[PDB]
Every structure is written in C-alpha cells, then in structure tokens.
Design a protein around this ligand. Sequence first.
Ligand SMILES: *[C@@H]1O[C@H](CO)[C@@H](O)[C@H](O)[C@H]1NC(C)=O
Ligand SMILES: *[C@@H]1O[C@H](CO)[C@@H](O)[C@H](O)[C@H]1NC(C)=O
Ligand SMILES: *[C@@H]1O[C@H](CO)[C@@H](O)[C@H](O)[C@H]1NC(C)=O
Ligand SMILES: *[C@@H]1O[C@H](CO)[C@@H](O)[C@H](O)[C@H]1NC(C)=O
Lengths: 185, 337, 48, 48, 406
Amino acid sequence: KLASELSNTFGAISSSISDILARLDTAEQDAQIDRLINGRLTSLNAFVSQQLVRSETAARSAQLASDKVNECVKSQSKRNGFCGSGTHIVSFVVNAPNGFYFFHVGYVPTNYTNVTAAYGLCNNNNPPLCIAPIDGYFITNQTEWYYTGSSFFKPEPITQANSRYVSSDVKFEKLENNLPPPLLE
Amino acid sequence: YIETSIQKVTVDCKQYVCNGFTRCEKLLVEYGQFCSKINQALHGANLRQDESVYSLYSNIKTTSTQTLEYGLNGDFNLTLLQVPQIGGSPSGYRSAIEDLLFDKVTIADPGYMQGYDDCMKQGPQSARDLICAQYVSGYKVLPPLYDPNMEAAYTSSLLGSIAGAGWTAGLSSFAAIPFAQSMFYRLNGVGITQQVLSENQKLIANKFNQALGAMQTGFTTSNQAFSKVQDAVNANAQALSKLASELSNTFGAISSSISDILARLDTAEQDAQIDRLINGRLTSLNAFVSQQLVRSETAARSAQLASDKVNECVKSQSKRNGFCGSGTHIVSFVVNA
Amino acid sequence: LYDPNMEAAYTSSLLGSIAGAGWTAGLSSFAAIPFAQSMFYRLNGVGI
Amino acid sequence: KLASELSNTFGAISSSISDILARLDTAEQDAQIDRLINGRLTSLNAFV
Amino acid sequence: FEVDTGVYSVSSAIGTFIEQPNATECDFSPMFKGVAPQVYNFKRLVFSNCNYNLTKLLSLFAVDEFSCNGISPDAIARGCYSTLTVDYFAYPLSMKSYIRPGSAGNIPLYNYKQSFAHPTCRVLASVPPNVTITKPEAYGYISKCSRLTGDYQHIETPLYINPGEYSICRDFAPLGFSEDGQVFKRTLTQFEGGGLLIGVGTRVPMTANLEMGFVISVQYGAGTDSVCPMLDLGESSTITNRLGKCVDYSLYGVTGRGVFQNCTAVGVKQQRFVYDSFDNLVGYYSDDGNYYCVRPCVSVPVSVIYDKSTNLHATLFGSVACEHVTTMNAPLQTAVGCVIGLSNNSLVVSECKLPLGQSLCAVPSVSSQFQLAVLNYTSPIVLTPINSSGFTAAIPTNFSFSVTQE
Ligand SMILES: *[C@@H]1O[C@H](CO)[C@@H](O)[C@H](O)[C@H]1NC(C)=O
Ligand SMILES: *[C@@H]1O[C@H](CO)[C@@H](O)[C@H](O)[C@H]1NC(C)=O
Ligand SMILES: *[C@@H]1O[C@H](CO)[C@@H](O)[C@H](O)[C@H]1NC(C)=O
Ligand SMILES: *[C@@H]1O[C@H](CO)[C@@H](O)[C@H](O)[C@H]1NC(C)=O
C-alpha cells in the first residue's frame, strides 16, 4: 500500500512530477506539485497511525506468548483448553516467522466403558469412618469394591494410598462385609 | 458480556463512488486499482471472521452430556435456562432467558432472506434507514456463519454438560452426577461443611432459586453488562451510519450529487468536479476498511477470552478470585447475546 | 533485533530445561530428572 | 498533533483565515476558506 | 485468471420525467422601452413562473464577455429554475475590467457590486443598431460618495455600497452627468444621520453602438413555480404508467433521479415538495392530484459462489426473493436469498469448505454438480444415567496422543 499510494494523482494531471514539469507553465506547475505534496503526507500519516496500532497489537501478543511459554512449555498446565485440547502433557515451542509456534501434546482417549462408580464407602460401625477414592473411582467388580484410575480403566485393590478419609453421608454405600484394608477395625 | 464478532459488511466500490451514473463510471476506469484493494481487503476481513467463529465453536463443544428435567432438577429450578416445553420442547430453540435478553435490545432486522423486497414496498421515507439504505449506497451486510438455531444448540449442550466426577484429576472421564448432587459438591469444596443440617437443602435451593429467578430485572441500561450489549449493537449501526453519511460530503465540489453537477455545469468542467467526488469517497472508503479491520481483530482477540470463561468457569468450577464474578464462584451459565 | 542463530538459541534451550523444572512446591529448585521419567510423572498426575 | 494540524495550508494561500481575508477578493475568499473547512474536519475525524 | 475458492461479492436505461407548468411568456419589454439606465441607476427584472424564447435573445444582442461563477450559460439555456434575476445597465466596453471581481476602481465601490450568494453570470454585450433601445447620452459613473461632518466640516467618511444594493449618491443625477467631474452637495436630515453628503460624477464619451451590462442570477428552491425555456411538451410529461422505474426527473425547478410510488399525502399541499431531514426529496404533490413517494434508485446485490477444484460457479442474489429475480437451471429460495446454480437434494453435511451463511453450505458433489447443503449440529454423547446407588461413569479403555499446533 505504501508503494501503490505513489501512483495516486490526487486530482493532478498525473502522479509523476516528471510529467507535471513537462506539460505546464511555471506558474501552474507549483499548483500541481502541491496536490502531490498535501497528498503523500496524508497517506504517510495513515501509514504512521496504522503502524502504531499493529505494533502495540504485537507487543500485547508478546505477553501472551511469554505467559503461554511459562505455563505450557516450562510446566504442566491444569487449565482447561489453555494448552491445546484434551488434558495437557507436554508442549514444545519453536521459532516461526514473526512469532512462536507451539506443539501441545495432549492425552485424548478413543474408547470408553461404563461403570457403577459409587461415591464412597462407609464402615458398618458406630462413629463410622468413610473412605472416598483419590484421583480415581470406586468401581464394582461388575460385591467387592475396587479402585481404578480416572484416565485409564484398570481395577486394583483398595488401600490407604488410594483412599481419603471423609465424613459419612447417606448417599454412601454401607459395607456389611468385604471391608477394604483401610476400613478394617 | 463478551463480544465475539462484528457485523460483516462488504462494499461495492463502483456503486458507492458512482451512484449508477455512466458519466462518473468512465472517469473511475482510470482508477480501479484502488477499488480492487478495497474489495479484496474487505473479503479477507470477512473471511477471517468466519475462521474465528469456526474456531470459537470448536473450543466450546462438549464431549458428552447427561439429561436434565424441565425445571426443579433436584430442588434447583433451571426453567429460565431451558427452552419452553408444553409436552416436549416445541416452538423454538433459544432458552427463556434469551427471549428476555433479546426483547430488551433494539436491533434493526437485517432481513437476510427477503430484505430487498421488504425495503422495496414499505418504508416510504425509511428507505434510507441503515438497513434499507444498503441497496442505495452500494454496501451490503453479510449473514453470520451459523443460524441462531445452531448457535442455540451449542449453549444448550453446555447446560447439561458432564465432566469427570469432581474429585478426579484429568479431563478424560465423564461422571453422570445429577445436577442437584453436583451443586452440593461445589458448595462443599468452598468451605461449607456436609453436616450443615443435611447441608440445609431446603434454604439453599430457595436462595439459589431466588437469585436465579431475579436476574430478569437486570436487563436495564443501569446494568453494566447489558449496557455493553447495547453499545455493541450501537457500534455496528454507527459503522453503517458513517458509511452513508459520507455520500453527502461535497469535498469542495458544488454539490454532493452527481446529478446536480451534470445539470449546472459544462462538459469540460464537470469532469473536474466529479473527480473531487471520486478522490473523496475513496479516501473515506480507505478509512472504513482501516476501521473495520481493527474492529475485526479486536473481536477476534475477545473471542479467545469468550472461550476462556466457558472453559474456566462454565465447564468447571473456578478457584480464581474476581475472574468469574464477585464472591466465591459456584456455577456459571452462558447464553447467546 | 536478534539474528536467527540467537533467536533459536533461546528456544533450543527450552527443550532441555526439564532440569529447570525441578518438580517440587516452588520454582526455586532444580532436579536433573531425565525426559523419560518426567513424562511418566506427567502421565501419572493426569489420572493414569 | 491536534494543534499542529491548525497550521496546515491544505492548498490554501495561507493557513490563517485572517491572511485569506486580507489578500483575496470576495469571490475567491469563500473558495479557500472552504479548503480549510474540508480539511480541519477530516483532521478532526482522524482524531476521533 | 486464477481465483481461490469462496463466495465473492461482484458488482437499465434511466428515463425522464418532466412536469412543467403552462405559463405565459416572460416579458422583456420594460428593458426595451426608455433610455437605458446608468451603472449606478441599474434596473432589475425578476422572472418567476414564465417562459422565455432563446432565439429572440440571441438575435437581439451581441455578447462580448460572459464571466460566470457557479453556473454556465448552457445550463441556464437548457434548464428550468425557480427564480431568474437580471440587473441591467449601460456600461462601456472599454471599462470592462473595472467591473470584474477584485477591481480597484470606483465601480465596485460606488456604482455596482456583484453578489456571489447564488450562481451568477456577468454578461457584457453590445446592442445592434436595428434593435430599438434608446441610447443614453455619454456614460456616467460615480467617483466619490462620502458624508462630510465635523464642526469645521473637516472629516470625510466614504460611503460604500453592499452587493446588489444601490448607492446613496444616486439621487444627485439619476439620468447622467452634464459635465465631467460634476460635484453635488446635499444636507442629510436628522433621522438619516445628518451632515453634508458630497458626490462626484465622471462622464465617459458615448460609443458608436450601445454597450450594456447584465448580471443574471438563478435561485433554486425559492417557490413553487419555474422559469423555463420554450419547449415541446413531449411524452415524458406523465409518470402514472412508469411507477417503479428509475427516471431522471425535472419537476418545477428541482432535478434529480428517483423512483415514484403511490402513497398517502403528508406535509402541506401548497409547498408541493416534501423533504426529509437531509434535504432529499421524498414526496411530490403532482399536478394530477396524487402524492407520489420518491425513493432513490436501488440495485440488486450479486455474489458468486466459486469452486476452483471442480471449476463450478453459482450466483447468489443476497436477500432477494426469487419472484423478483424471474420478473426483472431453476432459481431456488434459500435462507440467505435467491440462488441460481444450486440443486436441493436435501443434503446434510457435518463440515464443508464453502459457507453461504445462516448454516447453509454449497458442496460440489462428485459425479460435477453443486448441491445446497445444511450444516447439522453433532449432538454430544448423551451418557445414560443407569439406575443404581452410584453415578454411572465413563472411563477410557484406549487412548491416543494428539498434537495441537498454535
Ligand atoms: C420455577 O420457576 C418458574 C418461573 O416462572 C415457575 O413458573 C415455576 O413454578 C418454578 N418451579 C416451581 C417448582 O415452583
Ligand atoms: C421563438 O421565436 C422564433 C422566431 O420566429 C419562433 O420561430 C419560435 O417559434 C419561437 N419559439 C416558441 C414560440 O416557442
Ligand atoms: C394512488 O392512490 C391510492 C394509493 O394509496 C390508490 O387510490 C391508487 O393506487 C392511486 N389512485 C389513483 C386515483 O390512481
Ligand atoms: C428441499 O426440498 C424439500 C422438499 O421439497 C424441502 O422440505 C426443503 O426445505 C428444501 N430445502 C431447501 C434448502 O430449500
């Protein structure tokens, strides 16, 4: 646009000062140059104002790149949708023309299964201690209550490591027998 | 309110500049490297909005959902957020609270299907109104990428959206917890004990229902969020108003009408006065393209913020302060404005 | 401001900054955990 | 920038309206004061 | 010769409508009876609601200079106007420079100053000997006009006329000056300011033929009547058959372009022209007793849907019903206008390259035809809450890694 704004007549007989000088008398030449001079400065002021909008837009976008490097690249992100799609594992950054190119590696499942997934397990005892799972689900063998990870399906025995002590609830399932090791006595 | 798009407007450079006068068009043939640049710049700006809208609706889609009752899901009443149903949901797509939000907003119908014919008959003096003044001034208002029916389905699915339990790390499991039981987990996490009289169920739902039911009063210009909704509409109209008002500037000529110039002047000097109208109306169009490019980028950088709050405090509870409303954040809902 | 050689020195050094992470509470310590072990801790946190 | 655009001739013989009034005839006075009005209004629009 | 794939916004003999009144001939007789007036005693004729014959005027005068500002003589010759004002007098051709705008003489000071509020023409002409306009004696013009005051009558205030007005020293010798430099003195009354009015007159020898000056001014929008050149009524006099057609109109002095429809009357019937807030004609009280709405001429929008891979193209008439397209393949009405070149096979797609807007799509079905298609919302997995004492949950049994590039 800068180069093409020089081929604008601005009302003069031509956009070339060579042709203006080659066709008009000395009195009238200066009247046609001043059309090219008052133009070509309005067009430069448009360039100057436009390059201050573009420059601050990129300066604010540099903070976005700097923030996203400190979050996606130098650590694992717990935000939703900030660093790619799916749960975030690792990101890599490389240089690109006029910016940064990121590669966000995420964990996307492809197949699913349905389970019972009780809220918790209450002791069949007075002043009951109640175990809720941690970072997982309490799933039936489909009774024996087992534990599986949230992101991958693999039933395991319940233990103190994958159980968290919580207060009793009506919605919990009372265990008459088959108590897990954490809940015994 | 978060703005995600602007009104897509395109211009016909050979109709805005020369209002169908063959005397003006022949002088514009010397130009026409400045018209293509306007036509090509506006095509790109409108093309980038389509890619921004497509990107926004792929960042807020839902993997899986569960089904909710028409109201009184557990004791919490979500009717204001659900499309009305007599038997099953008839007679539209947008929820009850979108009806109230749109009715309080003054929007000129752009008539995407029969706009030309409606402006042709009605509007005896309303045929320069900003929508009916587009078949006169040579510009045009393009329809948005998605119809309001599909735009409503993306926000409806968000209401019944399901996520992984509430105490499980990761975004790869989905638990079908009923909405009522989900709310109690959100209240439990923020400090409320589970022995608070069965968590006072009759007195938490009532206060939730009272505050959620009283949000209809907020659709006034006294409200900040709704004020910004009207300013977004006003800005879109003002862009078209300034486009039409620049066809009344003389730019130093005897008149702003090429009919007057051709009727009061001789052949030699008419070409001098018309060229002032062509040298203007092209610089003005250069200012329009520059203005609408900045508005197109500003909306696109706010569509990213729109997708953020959908993911930070619509699809999951937010532990951040002030990001998603005053007070401790429990739950948020999103509708179309 | 910077030539391509120095522009890519910063990003090449980010790939190997896993020792700069130093998994703990806080950002003021560094742990020379290999890349392979870090991924298994990254996958272990997300539920697996 | 707002004040410095009041000293732009815009093609007129002089920027000051006083000079235009004191040097030209009534026929041409209103053809160059009009140049200062078409400018100084585009300049104001760019400020807005 | 090569354009990408997308929807592109690409770009009939206007007629004439003339209602002019049946009006009497403009009378120039007052100009031709009596001695021609002097420059300071010019005579003004105002013409409204009349017709003039250009042939007579061409024959009766021989024009020497026609300096015009705001208009051209041809425009005055082929156009109709509200008011025509002519200031005529006798002015020597040898002084033609002293009446120009910017002149430093005494003519613009004490004799005649031209006004530039409206379009004007200054015509210096000479009357042929056969034309019967009684020549004056030698020409005359005022060289001084001032008010003398002071106790000793020692201070003198020059008096200057305003554009189009008369001098205050006119009454000293309205028909001319007997001798060059003739001096006159008068005493002003108390109500007029008082003092000694002093005037001086200059006598210029008469020429061989009478030479006269004319200032012709046109006013638009100053009445409900027109001054027109004599012309044939023609066939463009009526509009009743041409409603809905874009026409150049010339109505009682106002000209433009528009389309006329039939509405109910608004405004004042007398004024005959209803205007909006922006000085555009919007209504017209025609002589046929009907009030016509005036709308600006409109153009149908056109866009092109183009597919480069299959080299297929269709046309979109945005927001236009197909009934209009046929009256002014098969046209098809969609939710964004009328489309020619697309077929309705009730196709539904999940995602596509060409969006038409409002969830419409154009997909080039292979085996060579565009088909109009509708985007369908993909419903997420509705996870069924089976009845139990716990919450049914979905847990992955197989996984993949996807890289998202930003
Ligand atoms: C829920 O709110 C709607 C809003 O009008 C009301 O009609 C309905 O009665 C409420 N539900 C109950 C159970 O009261
Ligand atoms: C104008 O005058 C000429 C002189 O003979 C005449 O032929 C012509 O018909 C006149 N025009 C009219 C009456 O419209
Ligand atoms: C014009 O006026 C009305 C329209 O409202 C109707 O009578 C008809 O279209 C026209 N009238 C006549 C007498 O032509
Ligand atoms: C296609 O035709 C069917 C039946 O003729 C109609 O229901 C449908 O609306 C049409 N589609 C479009 C886009 O017009």
